[PDB]
């Protein structure tokens, strides 16, 4: 019932979709909401009030594009326009899992925060792994000559390059596939809002897609990365009795033989119900002495008071 929207990018000018974001720039997010606003807000609109907002072709964009439907009387949008650190988002409205459909995309829980998190530097070439709406790529795009943005999700990827080209953006490409697959080549950047949470190692589905994911990334990342890259990952860690993840994570990297520094960030921590561990945090690859540390780092608490 929500996530399985038609979204067609392909469908519409480049011209055009850039004119409506520059139309969304104006109003999404901000007090005293236009027809485009409370469309992007789940409010259904007057057709006409937002002819005179976008133009008869940006109406028909709208259409085309999959971003309204015509419920006869009134226009109605299936997706949530975001804006936030110079670019224009569209994804999902924030729903519960009964209601989501298996295509759902992140309705940007964390991107807000990962974003500040990020490590200011830019570069040549980045790599957004699961990149969902697309707001980590196109927010790299600004400091990175070229972005690849990945997602398994084929919705997901079409709500990234109708994202990229709302903002008109030139420098990023998404692509459909199953992790490093179709991500050819090595990257100076790397960054991975990784879809894992309560789930342990079973995959519940791909926002909850299991350690594994973790596992395959990992093991991955040594030959996808250019030597000084950087990687940054949001992720949810066990630890078990015995078995802590950063043994795993050492062991997954080719840590000591790949000549990798790694720094993970420990954000929130509970008890599990087997004596073990869970966490969540923020871990870094980053160019210096070859080796794994921890350190404490409550980003959410500050976050939430400032
Ligand atoms: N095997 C796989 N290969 C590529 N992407 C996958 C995948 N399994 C899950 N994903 C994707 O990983 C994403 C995690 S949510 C993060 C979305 C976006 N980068 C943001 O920060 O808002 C989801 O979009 C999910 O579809
Ligand atoms: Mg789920």
Redesign the pocket.
Request: aromatic content about 4%; proline content about 3%; some cysteine.
């Given at each position: 019932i929500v996530g399985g929207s038609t979204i067609q990018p392909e469908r519409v000018d480049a011209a055009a979709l850039r004119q409506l974001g520059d139309a969304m720039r104006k109003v999404v997010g901000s007090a005293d909401p236009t027809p485009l606003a409370d469309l992007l807000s789940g409010t259904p609109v007057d057709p006409d009030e937002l002819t005179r907002e976008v133009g008869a072709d940006g109406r028909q964009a709208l259409l085309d594009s999959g971003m309204a439907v015509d419920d006869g009387t009134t226009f109605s949008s299936p997706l949530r326009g975001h804006q936030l650190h110079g670019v224009v988002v569209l994804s999902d409205p924030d729903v519960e899992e009964e209601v989501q459909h298996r295509w759902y995309?992140?309705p940007?829980?964390?991107?807000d925060l990962?974003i500040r998190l990020m490590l200011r530097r830019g570069g040549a070439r980045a790599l957004?792994?699961?990149?969902?709406?697309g707001?980590?790529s196109l927010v790299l795009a600004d400091r990175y000559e070229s972005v690849l943005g990945?997602?398994?999700?084929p919705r997901?990827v079409a709500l990234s390059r109708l994202n990229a080209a709302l903002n008109g953006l030139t420098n990023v490409t998404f692509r459909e596939?199953?992790?490093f697959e179709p991500a050819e080549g090595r990257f100076s950047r790397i960054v991975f809002?990784?879809?894992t949470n309560e789930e342990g190692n079973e995959f519940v589905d791909?926002?909850e897609?299991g350690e594994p994911?973790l596992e395959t990334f990992f093991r991955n990342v040594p030959r996808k990365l250019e030597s000084g890259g950087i990687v940054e990952v949001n992720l949810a860690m066990n630890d078990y009795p015995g078995d802590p993840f950063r043994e795993r994570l050492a062991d997954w990297l080719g840590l000591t033989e790949n000549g990798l520094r790694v720094q993970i960030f420990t954000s929130q921590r509970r008890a599990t119900e087997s004596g073990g561990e869970w966490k969540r945090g923020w871990l870094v690859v980053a160019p210096g002495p070859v080796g794994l540390t921890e350190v404490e780092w409550p980003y959410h608490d500050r976050y939430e008071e400032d």
């Open positions: 995309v992140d940007l829980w964390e991107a990962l957004d792994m699961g990149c969902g709406s707001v980590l990945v997602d398994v999700n997901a596939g199953d992790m809002n990784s879809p791909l926002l897609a994911i």
